[PDB]
Design a binder for this molecule. Sequence first.
Ligand SMILES: *[C@@H]1O[C@H](CO)[C@@H](O[C@@H]2O[C@H](CO)[C@@H](O[C@@H]3O[C@H](CO[C@H]4O[C@H](CO[C@H]5O[C@H](CO)[C@@H](O)[C@H](O)[C@@H]5O)[C@@H](O)[C@H](O)[C@@H]4O[C@H]4O[C@H](CO)[C@@H](O)[C@H](O)[C@@H]4O)[C@@H](O)[C@H](O[C@H]4O[C@H](CO)[C@@H](O)[C@H](O)[C@@H]4O)[C@@H]3O)[C@H](O)[C@H]2NC(C)=O)[C@H](O)[C@H]1NC(C)=O
Ligand SMILES: *[C@@H]1O[C@H](CO)[C@@H](O[C@@H]2O[C@H](CO)[C@@H](O[C@@H]3O[C@H](CO[C@H]4O[C@H](CO)[C@@H](O)[C@H](O)[C@@H]4O)[C@@H](O)[C@H](O[C@H]4O[C@H](CO)[C@@H](O)[C@H](O)[C@@H]4O)[C@@H]3O)[C@H](O)[C@H]2NC(C)=O)[C@H](O)[C@H]1NC(C)=O
Ligand SMILES: *[C@@H]1O[C@H](CO)[C@@H](O[C@@H]2O[C@H](CO)[C@@H](O[C@@H]3O[C@H](CO[C@H]4O[C@H](CO)[C@@H](O)[C@H](O)[C@@H]4O)[C@@H](O)[C@H](O)[C@@H]3O)[C@H](O)[C@H]2NC(C)=O)[C@H](O)[C@H]1NC(C)=O
Ligand SMILES: *[C@@H]1O[C@H](CO)[C@@H](O[C@@H]2O[C@H](CO)[C@@H](O)[C@H](O)[C@H]2NC(C)=O)[C@H](O)[C@H]1NC(C)=O
Ligand SMILES: *[C@@H]1O[C@H](CO)[C@@H](O[C@@H]2O[C@H](CO)[C@@H](O)[C@H](O)[C@H]2NC(C)=O)[C@H](O)[C@H]1NC(C)=O
Ligand SMILES: *[C@@H]1O[C@H](CO)[C@@H](O[C@@H]2O[C@H](CO)[C@@H](O)[C@H](O)[C@H]2NC(C)=O)[C@H](O)[C@H]1NC(C)=O
Ligand SMILES: *[C@@H]1O[C@H](CO)[C@@H](O)[C@H](O)[C@H]1NC(C)=O
Ligand SMILES: *[C@@H]1O[C@H](CO)[C@@H](O)[C@H](O)[C@H]1NC(C)=O
Ligand SMILES: *[C@@H]1O[C@H](CO)[C@@H](O)[C@H](O)[C@H]1NC(C)=O
Ligand SMILES: *[C@@H]1O[C@H](CO)[C@@H](O)[C@H](O)[C@H]1NC(C)=O
Ligand SMILES: *[C@@H]1O[C@H](CO)[C@@H](O)[C@H](O)[C@H]1NC(C)=O
Ligand SMILES: *[C@@H]1O[C@H](CO)[C@@H](O)[C@H](O)[C@H]1NC(C)=O
Ligand SMILES: *[C@@H]1O[C@H](CO)[C@@H](O)[C@H](O)[C@H]1NC(C)=O
Lengths: 97, 119, 119, 580
Amino acid sequence: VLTQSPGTLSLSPGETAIISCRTSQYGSLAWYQQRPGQAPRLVIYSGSTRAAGIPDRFSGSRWGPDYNLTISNLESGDFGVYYCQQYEFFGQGTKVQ
Amino acid sequence: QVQLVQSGGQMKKPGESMRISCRASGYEFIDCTLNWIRLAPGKRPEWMGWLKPRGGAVNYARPLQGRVTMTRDVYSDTAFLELRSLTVDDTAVYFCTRGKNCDYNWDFEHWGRGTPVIV
Amino acid sequence: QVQLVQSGGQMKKPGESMRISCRASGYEFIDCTLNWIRLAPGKRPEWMGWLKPRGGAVNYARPLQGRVTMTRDVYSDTAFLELRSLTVDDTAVYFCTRGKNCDYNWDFEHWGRGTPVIV
Amino acid sequence: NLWVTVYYGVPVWKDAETTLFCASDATEKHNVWATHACVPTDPNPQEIHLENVIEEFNMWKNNMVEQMHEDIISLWDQSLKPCVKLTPLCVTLQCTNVTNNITDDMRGELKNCSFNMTTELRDKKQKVYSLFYRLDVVQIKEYRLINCNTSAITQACPKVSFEPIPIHYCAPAGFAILKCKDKKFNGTGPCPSVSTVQCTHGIKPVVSTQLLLNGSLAEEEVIIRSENITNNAKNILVQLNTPVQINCTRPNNNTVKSIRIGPGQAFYYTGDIIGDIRQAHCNVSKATWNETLGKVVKQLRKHFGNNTIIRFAQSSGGDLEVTTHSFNCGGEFFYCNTSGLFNSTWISNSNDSITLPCRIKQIINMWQRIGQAMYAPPIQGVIRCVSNITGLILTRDGGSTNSTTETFRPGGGDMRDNWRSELYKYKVVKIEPLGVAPTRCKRFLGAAGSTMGAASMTLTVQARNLLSGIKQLQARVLAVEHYLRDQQLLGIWGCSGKLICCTNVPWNSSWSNRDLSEIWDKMTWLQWDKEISNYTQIIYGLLEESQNQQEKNEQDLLALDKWASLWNWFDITNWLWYIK
Ligand SMILES: *[C@@H]1O[C@H](CO)[C@@H](O[C@@H]2O[C@H](CO)[C@@H](O[C@@H]3O[C@H](CO[C@H]4O[C@H](CO[C@H]5O[C@H](CO)[C@@H](O)[C@H](O)[C@@H]5O)[C@@H](O)[C@H](O)[C@@H]4O[C@H]4O[C@H](CO)[C@@H](O)[C@H](O)[C@@H]4O)[C@@H](O)[C@H](O[C@H]4O[C@H](CO)[C@@H](O)[C@H](O)[C@@H]4O)[C@@H]3O)[C@H](O)[C@H]2NC(C)=O)[C@H](O)[C@H]1NC(C)=O
Ligand SMILES: *[C@@H]1O[C@H](CO)[C@@H](O[C@@H]2O[C@H](CO)[C@@H](O[C@@H]3O[C@H](CO[C@H]4O[C@H](CO)[C@@H](O)[C@H](O)[C@@H]4O)[C@@H](O)[C@H](O[C@H]4O[C@H](CO)[C@@H](O)[C@H](O)[C@@H]4O)[C@@H]3O)[C@H](O)[C@H]2NC(C)=O)[C@H](O)[C@H]1NC(C)=O
Ligand SMILES: *[C@@H]1O[C@H](CO)[C@@H](O[C@@H]2O[C@H](CO)[C@@H](O[C@@H]3O[C@H](CO[C@H]4O[C@H](CO)[C@@H](O)[C@H](O)[C@@H]4O)[C@@H](O)[C@H](O)[C@@H]3O)[C@H](O)[C@H]2NC(C)=O)[C@H](O)[C@H]1NC(C)=O
Ligand SMILES: *[C@@H]1O[C@H](CO)[C@@H](O[C@@H]2O[C@H](CO)[C@@H](O)[C@H](O)[C@H]2NC(C)=O)[C@H](O)[C@H]1NC(C)=O
Ligand SMILES: *[C@@H]1O[C@H](CO)[C@@H](O[C@@H]2O[C@H](CO)[C@@H](O)[C@H](O)[C@H]2NC(C)=O)[C@H](O)[C@H]1NC(C)=O
Ligand SMILES: *[C@@H]1O[C@H](CO)[C@@H](O[C@@H]2O[C@H](CO)[C@@H](O)[C@H](O)[C@H]2NC(C)=O)[C@H](O)[C@H]1NC(C)=O
Ligand SMILES: *[C@@H]1O[C@H](CO)[C@@H](O)[C@H](O)[C@H]1NC(C)=O
Ligand SMILES: *[C@@H]1O[C@H](CO)[C@@H](O)[C@H](O)[C@H]1NC(C)=O
Ligand SMILES: *[C@@H]1O[C@H](CO)[C@@H](O)[C@H](O)[C@H]1NC(C)=O
Ligand SMILES: *[C@@H]1O[C@H](CO)[C@@H](O)[C@H](O)[C@H]1NC(C)=O
Ligand SMILES: *[C@@H]1O[C@H](CO)[C@@H](O)[C@H](O)[C@H]1NC(C)=O
Ligand SMILES: *[C@@H]1O[C@H](CO)[C@@H](O)[C@H](O)[C@H]1NC(C)=O
Ligand SMILES: *[C@@H]1O[C@H](CO)[C@@H](O)[C@H](O)[C@H]1NC(C)=O
């Protein structure tokens, strides 16, 4: 029902990552990060609210039925797979490299 | 302090049935939902179902109805996911998850270690 | 609701003894006085006695003193009227009665079915 | 030139939660569901409609539901507490199938289940034969009771009945219950028409899992209540326009007998079944249920796509409480299989009863607590009920990608939904009587929507309602504390007397000016309190400083000793010799 773009995002350290997510339903959108080999962890919920322990680097804001995840000054703990989530519906996921 | 501990490392061939246990601790087990998530490499994540352990009420994802069962033990705070009629497309890591709070359960801060299953 | 239930139809000869039960229900059996009335055609109504089934206290009428005993089983909620040396003039219908309220005893509102006794 | 004035008792509302006390209309009845801590009800004497008020009602987050859940749980536990424990009955039973005299199938799965037991004298023992339902007994043919290895079982006292008795919930002094009288009120939104009521409309504690029974009915049409119906987790409550009559029964004579398990303790069990062993059943008229499902389908089609195919289905899984309709009838607990009434499919657009099988358990663990259970004693004779299926609880099977089909299943397990179905209209509002307004002086609950100045003419009545186990004492003490706080603040401002008090504080333009023309003419007090809520602390502080400290100093000993014929000496100088 929802999707996200780009499928793969090839960036270098220190650059800013932007990931877009298109939704066809009204509902709060959460963003999750998956480190390769570990369980995924929530990075933000309700579109713009951060989970506990997440630095200020992660943020997001948008208008209309679209959402944006912005990640400034990428660090080594980044470069996972980033998932959209609506009411028990996920996106295909964006792999940041 | 909320912790979810999963048993795993299972390998199954097509046609077999499988069971995963998920022990929950650090919070009142009864009053808060659990959800099951299937993450496969290269596929979209699939939500498998939710379980309310107070009455054991279970909601299965529509594509998997007739295959999935979820039960629970409250005296030993465990949630059991049983999946039947495995196929090659069921290879994935299975997670037991709970929301940030027990009013809006979709904000899954708390995830288990993850149970790999290879078929 | 208040109900008093008796068992009757006794047929006796002169000189024999008789026992009539009166099961009380609805009101708290141990918090209200019972009375035993005798009715018959021709002769007046006669009061037999009162029973306070907490201490078991009893008061008998003067014509019947030495012949009439009253007992109470608080666990079956059952009063008992025992009469000795029954004779022809005691042929009558016996009532187990309770007052309208438990403060004034002589407003007999609650009467049982009645217990015929033919000597 | 408009300056501050202080009003006490203006009608305004804060949505704070509070403890709400009992109100139950007035010996056999005292056995059941009544702790006689509950005052007799007045005959709905004060239902003051409020005209032109728009209040936000949210059924899903109201403290009355949680308070009622706690109160009903405590009532149940208090009723059970002075009753015989069945810890002696956790013994090894040798069970055999019920005697059909041939190999005929046992119906209801009754099992003979002899055991050794105890008696009043500690030394002796008494073999007992007692038919137990198979759901109650678990194997270890050696058999034991279901709950022995987890929880102690407390028998319900034999005389005690469980039939629902209406309970009216009435707010304490200083808090007023607001009822939303709007028809077609889906439970979460602005309510066009509100009324103030002292006591709720006698809510009946009735415990039913899938299908609500004996509840209140809607006036116009079926109503579908759910917060975020898109969400799968949240239960869809359904209030039905027309009652559907369910006729329920156990057809067994059920010869009951008693034994004494100890000093002053008795155990009641099924000695025998005189008649044929027959299954318990519940009948629902097929045509009535078909029409009811059609109406529910229409209201559900409104929320989802109009083209969508709405399909019902049996409950997917859970405990026997969740998976099957649970309810008590005449003191006997029925678990009825609703798959007969929910397996239809509705595609986009008689005198035969759907008979639901029912199984009866004696050992009930209701409220789903850990470590507790209750043995319901068997009831002699055939039992019947004629309940009305006034409401339903549903949940939508989720996770589907595209596709027009929506699967709805019976749901439950959490009993808060039952009481949400009845307490949806009610809200609890605190009364914050104090208020501050502009005026040129410069020196119950009715008419809430009436503009300012109309309120003042009736002001006193609100001041009359204020001031009127452990939680009730806390409620009363907090009411007294709130009243003393309000009176102390009134005194510190110089307004020791209640009602209108005028004070010399200039109405600053910063404090939400508003033009000071329609404020008093066209507007009600609540919208004002919405406007000036943020500035209220500054106004209170300035009131205290201006007409309490400065007024004390300019009416301190100043003017106490007034003898001044040579006043203003630094001006008596100014025309002492200047005139010369
Ligand atoms: C289930 O629960 C969820 C919450 O968990 C509920 O979802 C919320 O529903 C409400 C309505 O009940 C939604 O408000 C409506 O949203 C519409 C769009 O609002 C978003 O976008 C606008 C900007 O839109 C402009 O641009 C659009 C694209 O060109 C265009 O289509 C539109 O017309 C406008 O020109 C933002 O200003 C607004 O903040 C909001 O932002 C969304 O996206 C961002 C992404 O970053 C996210 O942060 C936000 O949370 C949100 O997702 C809009 O149609 C509608 O406006 C109507 O009302 C206004 C009143 O001011 C009126 O001016 C206008 O004419 C319309 O009548 C309204 O605002 C709300 O966004 C939903 N929130 C979420 C989180 O999903 C859901 O309703 C509930 N379901 C049920 C059944 O109860
Ligand atoms: C939804 O609401 C309906 C409608 O009220 C309820 O149906 C009632 O169910 C109760 C029991 O659950 C019924 O009350 C019981 O009826 C039995 C028959 O009563 C006999 O005696 C009375 C004397 O007044 C006569 O009028 C009547 O004709 C019969 O001769 C009795 O078994 C019960 O009384 C006995 O047990 C109780 C213990 O509870 C004792 O207090 C009594 O002293 C006595 O020993 C009792 O009266 C009632 O009749 C039903 N109403 C009807 C048919 O209209 C549903 O129960 C309710 N649904 C749910 C799920 O709660
Ligand atoms: C769900 O709704 C469905 C649609 O109405 C129901 O499915 C139908 O259920 C019937 C009953 O089983 C199926 O079988 C029919 O039954 C009789 C013959 O049954 C005989 O044997 C049974 C033994 O159990 C006995 O009880 C009966 O009295 C009979 O003696 C015939 O009339 C038919 O030929 C047919 O075989 C139907 O096939 C089935 N229909 C469909 C379209 O699937 C279903 O019962 C509903 N479920 C519930 C729980 O109510
Ligand atoms: C008390 O006994 C019950 C019944 O044996 C235990 O529950 C499970 O029952 C199922 C029924 O199919 C068995 O397959 C399981 O093996 C039982 N569990 C166990 C651990 O044996 C229940 O767990 C027991 N309670 C406690 C607290 O141990
Ligand atoms: C449960 O089994 C017992 C033992 O077989 C049955 O009790 C017997 O009942 C028969 C028929 O009424 C009597 O003649 C015997 O004297 C009883 N035996 C004893 C040892 O008491 C009992 O009837 C069975 N339960 C039923 C039929 O519900
Ligand atoms: C409620 O009754 C229905 C009656 O059909 C039962 O449905 C059966 O469920 C079993 C369980 O696997 C299936 O094998 C049958 O095919 C079902 N029958 C039909 C016609 O669909 C249901 O199991 C009962 N529920 C409970 C809790 O006893
Ligand atoms: C009782 O009946 C069941 C079927 O419900 C059967 O399997 C079992 O063998 C029977 N047991 C005895 C002791 O007769
Ligand atoms: C009851 O106790 C006696 C004591 O001798 C024992 O032999 C017998 O097996 C017990 N009976 C049952 C039915 O458990
Ligand atoms: C119906 O409920 C929805 C939420 O599902 C709410 O937004 C809306 O205001 C309600 N409608 C009314 C009260 O008319
Ligand atoms: C149960 O059996 C007794 C035996 O005396 C009989 O009087 C009674 O009517 C029976 N009960 C029913 C409901 O038929
Ligand atoms: C239920 O019983 C009543 C009488 O108590 C009868 O009028 C009604 O038709 C019955 N309803 C059903 C659905 O069997
Ligand atoms: C009766 O039920 C059938 C089958 O579910 C349905 O097609 C029909 O519309 C219903 N009739 C009504 C509600 O009048
Ligand atoms: C059941 O429905 C009928 C018909 O509307 C109604 O008169 C009756 O009062 C209802 N029963 C109860 C117990 O509310």
